[PDB]
Amino acid sequence: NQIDLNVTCRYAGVFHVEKNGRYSISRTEAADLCQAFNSTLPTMDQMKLALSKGFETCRYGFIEGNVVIPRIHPNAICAANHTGVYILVTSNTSHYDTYCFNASAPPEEDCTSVTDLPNSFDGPVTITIVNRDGTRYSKKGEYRTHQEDI
């Protein structure tokens, strides 16, 4: 009973979380997942500020109200070569990665690793935070509050 959560640098408190190496998070799960990091789904304004500080990914993820990809450098296989906060408009499907926003993180680029999951609750899952540099932090718990996400 294991969940891997790959996380990134934080940029103005915003970071990306990919679960189990696949698009696999629902909007309800995303809010619960960010809550386990004492975080919330970013607002568009928070995401735009993070982008301005150097944040980009090549993965769709929830923010508050939309599913987006922050892009700095045009890449044909990331958000159709767009720059800025690219907003997904048309999709059949409901599961993506998520972004999260931690107000207590540093104001600009924070590329230190994540070494805790401070607000997970008691539960049976081995949850492993996987940093981009491969460093890991694991703890037994749960973060999902909606049965349909389990």
Ligand X SMILES: O=C(Nc1ccccc1)Nc1cccnc1
86 is in an annotated binding site: yes
105 near ligand X, judged by CB under 6 A? yes
66 near ligand X, judged by CB under 6 A? no
Task: Give the residue with the Cβ less far from ligand X, 107 or 118.
Answer: 118
Task: Give the residue with the Cβ less far from ligand X, 84 or 118.
Answer: 118
Say whether 81 sits in a helix, a strand or coil. helix
84 near ligand X, judged by CB under 6 A? no
Q: Left, alpha or beta for 12 (phi > 0: left; psi -120 to 50: alpha)?
A: left
Task: Give the residue with the Cβ less far from ligand X, 30 or 105.
Answer: 105
Residue from 2, 90, 104, 147 binding ligand X (CB under 6 A): 104
User: In degrees rounded to 5, what are phi and psi of residue 127?
Assistant: -100, 120
- Number of alpha helices (DSSP H) and beta strands (DSSP E) in the chain: 2, 10
Site string (111-150) toward ligand X, x via CB under 6 A: ---x-x-x--------------------------------
For residue 96, give the H/E element and its range: none
Instruction: Decide: 88 and 78 in contact? Cβ < 8 Å.
Output: no
Q: Report H helices in the chain.
A: 27-36, 44-52
Contacting residues toward ligand X, per CB under 6 A:
10, 15, 37-39, 102, 104-105, 114, 116, 118
